[PDB]
Design a protein around this ligand. Sequence first.
Ligand SMILES: C[C@H]1CNCCN1c1nccc(-c2noc([C@@]3(C)CCCc4sc(N)c(C#N)c43)n2)n1
Ligand SMILES: Nc1nc2c(ncn2[C@@H]2O[C@H](COP(=O)(O)OP(=O)(O)O)[C@@H](O)[C@H]2O)c(=O)[nH]1
Ligand SMILES: [Mg+2]
Length: 168
Amino acid sequence: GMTEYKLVVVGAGGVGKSALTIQLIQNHFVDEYDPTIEDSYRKQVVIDGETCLLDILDTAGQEEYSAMRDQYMRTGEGFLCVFAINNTKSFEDIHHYREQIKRVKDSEDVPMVLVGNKSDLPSRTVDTKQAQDLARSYGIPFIETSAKTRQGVDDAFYTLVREIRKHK
Ligand SMILES: C[C@H]1CNCCN1c1nccc(-c2noc([C@@]3(C)CCCc4sc(N)c(C#N)c43)n2)n1
Ligand SMILES: Nc1nc2c(ncn2[C@@H]2O[C@H](COP(=O)(O)OP(=O)(O)O)[C@@H](O)[C@H]2O)c(=O)[nH]1
Ligand SMILES: [Mg+2]
């Protein structure tokens, strides 16, 4: 049967979670997508010759630490933790997202990729070295993306699928 992989995209508002997701789903850059919309989208993709079904949850909205939200995030098998390379605050929030994932999955080994988005922009405030070193601290991959140009998009999502396969 075709394996389905439940992937969750997290990170500060405005980093490009929706743009990245819609790039994967539509193969089109969408510069405007209602920042409140949290939803899930499926795509069949060929990853290393295997057609698998991706189910991507593009998260949005305020923090909610209810039992219900924790149960829903626990459905995720892997997580993209996204920051924007021109927004320091978004990078400094990454540890919070990683800590919430570790808590809800009750594991120090959750499949995860660190994503530095907006790589097409000239306004960098987060050095690539600093981001690579954060991923090294966590023992996870780091991928540089642009939802605008499609740089890194398959790399981010497909690496996460390979991380889940190694974990299973
Ligand atoms: C960085 C902080 C603190 N300063 C203000 C901004 N902020 C913030 N804003 C908005 C959202 C969040 C935030 N944290 O974790 C999560 C997620 C979706 C990540 C995946 C695992 C779980 S499990 C659970 N119940 C979740 C929630 N709600 C989450 N989302 N964090
Ligand atoms: N230049 C550029 N802008 C982007 C990129 N990804 C998203 N954006 C812009 O960043 C803003 C937030 O994107 P959005 O996908 O709504 O972020 P979300 O709140 O994390 O879902 C919008 O103004 C998008 O046009 C990217 O890779 N490059
Ligand atoms: Mg969004």
